[PDB]
């Protein structure tokens, strides 16, 4: 002790930036009467230190003056969560009785010495969250008594040593955040007691070893975010204890092995972001424990098997971004726990099944860019748990007020590019959590129900390219949280409400291709975030108000195809960020204000088909203007 | 994806009292359905309209991961810290609006790689240093403003800056 205690005390002297409130204030008397009872972090057997525990003590220093020659009986060493810097000495391999070695969460650098391989009594090795570099020494394979190795979040390079096949007692192998290289050693498939194998987020190349079919005890296999190639070995189906299988973000090829259906314990399966091809094996319907099934972003083809109706515990089904085709089998939506159904970016056909929301738990449903047709099933109308619903780009049909019910939890919905008809039901107001209502390019008619403006939480509203009638009320001001407002391409009439003044958060306004009939509100001068305003193809009938020139942030402003008259106010020179102007097809008169030469951001102008006269101020926009941009004026010099 | 993870990184470095960044759902494939972000036809981010958002915090180097980001509007906020030189990785770039903030430190010399830059406004800040010579080689810059900043050094008219007027350099303590 007295030699051990004095040797430890000499090492404590190396510590830097240590305050008097440190836990190591207890290291005072080198006599055994206090060394083995009152020194923080030390424990003795027969009066000799066997245990050194200094986790999370705030020590800053090095192991250079660690008393290797003075502590022969160390069997438990934890120095994690400190500020130790330097390298791992080969002397660490001298502690013949050591069983637990932890130097995680530190600032160590350099290679791992081969001498660590001669710690024949070691049970657990932790070197986590350091900056160690080099290749793992082959001598680590001498640790026949080890059960857990964790060296993840480091700068390790080179291959995994094939000598690891000698570590028969290993149950846990954690090496994920690293830069290991080469093929997986096939001896790793022969570890009998292995339970968890995490090799994800590395630079591994080559095929998955077919010997992995021997790992009858492994429940977790993380190898995602690698450069694995070839095909998934069918022998993986012999891994009858496997719970989670994640090979996502790799360069695997070929079809899914039909032998995945043998693993009755498999609950999670991530195969996404790869290059697998072929058709979905019908045997995948026999993965009875399956909960999370993800095959997104691949090159799969063919129909989904009806056997998916046997997956009674399925909650997430990710099949998006593939080349699957045909109709959806009703078995897909059989699960009462089904919560997420992502199917966009595919080549499907036909109708949605009536099982779509059988359990009443479906949250997210995505069908973008497919060839679905027919009406909305009744189970989806009455499904109240919807959060995200994406129907964009299909041939769906039916009455829009008869298709959809009430959704208290609805957050986002996009029904654009479809064939819905009818008039909007006021039921949408009850979806008080909705923030995005996007319904463009449909056959919808009628007037906008007034209750829509009472949806205060709405931030984006897109009813463009429809046949909606009526006029916008002054209650338009109720939705001031809006930032994108797209009502263009409709049959909206009457005057533009001055309540648009109070929608301050507005970034993007599109009211063009409509039938607005009276003069522009002079009070639209307080939109400090608007960069876009399009009022083209309407019936506005007076002079451009001076309030428009006060919106500093406009980038584009299109007032074309109107009955606007009067003179072009020179105060448009104030719009310092304006890049585009279009005033064509109007009855504007007078001369173009010569102050416009100072609009350096202006790049595109059109003034054609008007009643103006005089020479053009000289700027970049006017010089590059084509002859169309001045057509049909009176006396433009 | 990669662009969404980068904008998620910004979302974690800014204190958002006004709940502007709420729509920035990180588990989406692309951030193109988020608010205040607009994409082109290829689902690559081209605009970030975060002006006057009452955001507080520090910028994040991951802002250089938007190759197609043409307009970056972070003006009129209480953001602090420095300008990370990784913004020079914005190969396609038109507008840089960081004015009206609490930013400090130098003007990274890496901004000379944004040869497409038209508008650069950094006024009303705590920036300190000298104007890099690299900014003189862009030849696309049209509108420039470094007012209300405690910089130093003489006004660098190396050719491109020949067209600019003292309002661009007013209250700068340059000379």
């Amino acid at each position: 002790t007295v030699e051990e205690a004095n040797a430890l005390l000499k090492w404590k002297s190396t510590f830097t930036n240590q305050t008097s409130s440190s836990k190591l204030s207890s290291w005072v008397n080198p006599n055994t009467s206090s060394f083995c009872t009152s020194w923080y972090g030390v424990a003795c057997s027969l009066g000799s230190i066997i245990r050194l525990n200094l986790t999370n003590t705030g020590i800053e220093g090095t192991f250079e003056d660690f008393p290797f020659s003075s502590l022969p009986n160390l069997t438990f060493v934890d120095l994690s969560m400190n500020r130790f810097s330097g390298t791992i000495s080969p002397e660490w391999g001298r502690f013949s009785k050591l069983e637990y070695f932890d130097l995680s969460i530190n600032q160590l650098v350099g290679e791992i010495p081969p001498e660590l391989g001669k710690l024949s009594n070691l049970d657990t090795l932790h070197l986590v969250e350091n900056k160690l570099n080099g290749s793992i020494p082959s001598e680590i394979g001498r640790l026949t008594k080890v059960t857990e190795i964790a060296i993840y979040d480091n700068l390790l390079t080179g291959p995994i040593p094939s000598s690891f096949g000698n570590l028969t007692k290993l149950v846990n192998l954690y090496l994920f955040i690293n830069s290991l290289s080469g093929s997986i050693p096939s001896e790793i498939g022969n570890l009998p007691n292995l339970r968890e194998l995490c090799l994800d987020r590395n630079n591994l190349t080559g095929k998955i070893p077919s010997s992995f079919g021997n790992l009858k005890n492994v429940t977790l296999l993380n190898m995602f975010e690698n450069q694995l190639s070839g095909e998934i070995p069918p022998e993986i189906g012999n891994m009858t204890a496997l719970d989670t299988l994640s090979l996502h973000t790799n360069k695997l090829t070929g079809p899914i092995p039909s032998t995945l259906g043998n693993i009755k314990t498999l609950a999670v399966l991530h195969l996404y972001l790869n290059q697998l091809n072929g058709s979905i094996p019908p045997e995948l319907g026999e993965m009875e424990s399956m909960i999370d099934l993800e095959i997104s972003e691949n090159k799969l083809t063919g129909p989904v098997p009806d056997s998916f109706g046997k997956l009674t515990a399925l909650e997430w089904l990710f099949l998006r971004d593939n080349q699957l085709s045909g109709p959806i089998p009703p078995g897909i939506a059989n699960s009462t726990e089904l919560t997420v159904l992502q199917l966009d970016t595919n080549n499907f056909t036909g109708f949605l099944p009536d099982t779509i929301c059988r359990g009443g738990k479906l949250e997210n449903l995505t069908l973008d860019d497919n060839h679905f047709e027919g009406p909305v099933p009744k189970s989806l109308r009455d499904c109240k748990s919807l959060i995200r619903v994406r129907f964009k780009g299909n041939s769906f049909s039916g009455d829009i007020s008869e298709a959809f019910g009430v959704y208290p939890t609805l957050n986002f919905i996009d029904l654009s590019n479809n064939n819905f008809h009818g008039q909007l039901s006021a039921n949408w107001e009850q979806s008080q959590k909705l923030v995005a209502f996007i319904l463009s390019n449909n056959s919808i008619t009628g007037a906008i129900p007034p209750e829509i403006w009472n949806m205060t939480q709405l931030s984006q509203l897109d009813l463009s390219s429809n046949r909606i009638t009526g006029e916008l009320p002054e209650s338009i001001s109720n939705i001031n949280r809006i930032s994108k407002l797209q009502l263009n391409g409709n049959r909206l009439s009457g005057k533009i409400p001055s309540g648009i003044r109070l929608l301050t958060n507005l970034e993007y306004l599109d009211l063009s291709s409509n039938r607005f009939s009276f003069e522009i509100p002079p009070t639209l001068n307080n939109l400090p975030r608007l960069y876009y305003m399009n009022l083209s193809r309407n019936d506005l009938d007076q002079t451009i108000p001076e309030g428009l020139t006060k919106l500093s942030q406009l980038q584009m402003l299109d007032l074309s195809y109107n009955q606007l008259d009067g003179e072009i106010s020179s105060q448009f020179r104030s719009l310092q960020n304006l890049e585009r102007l279009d005033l064509s097809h109007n009855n504007l008169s007078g001369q173009i204000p010569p102050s416009f030469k100072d609009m350096l951001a202006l790049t595109h102008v059109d003034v054609s088909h008007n009643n103006l006269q005089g020479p053009i101020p000289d700027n970049a926009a006017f010089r590059n203007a084509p002859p169309d941009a001045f057509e049909g004026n009176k006396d433009l010099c | 994806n990669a662009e969404g993870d980068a904008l998620s990184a910004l979302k974690n470095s800014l204190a958002d009292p006004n709940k502007v960044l709420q729509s920035w759902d990180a588990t989406l494939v692309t951030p193109c359905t988020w608010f205040h972000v607009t994409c082109n036809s290829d689902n690559s981010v081209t605009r970030v309209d975060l002006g006057n958002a009452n955001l507080s915090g520090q910028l994040v180097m991951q802002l250089g991961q938007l190759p197609n980001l043409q307009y970056l509007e972070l003006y009129s906020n209480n953001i602090t810290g420095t300008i990370p030189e990784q913004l020079g990785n914005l190969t396609e770039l038109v507008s840089l609006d960081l004015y009206l903030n609490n930013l400090s430190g130098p003007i990274p010399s890496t901004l000379g790689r944004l040869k497409k830059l038209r508008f650069l406004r950094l006024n009303n800040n705590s920036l300190s240093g000298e104007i890099p010579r690299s900014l003189t080689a862009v030849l696309t810059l049209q509108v420039l403003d470094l007012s209300n900043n405690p910089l130093t050094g003489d006004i660098p008219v190396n050719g491109s800056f020949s067209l600019f007027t003292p309002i661009s350099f007013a209250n700068t303590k340059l000379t």
């Binding site: 995680s104 932790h126 964790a150 968890e196 995490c198 993380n222 972001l273 995505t366 | 994806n1 989406l28």
Partner: peptide
Amino acid sequence: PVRSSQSSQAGGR
């Protein structure tokens, strides 16, 4: 504490 890595979910639309 030493933990095992968790697989992250696929991106949704």
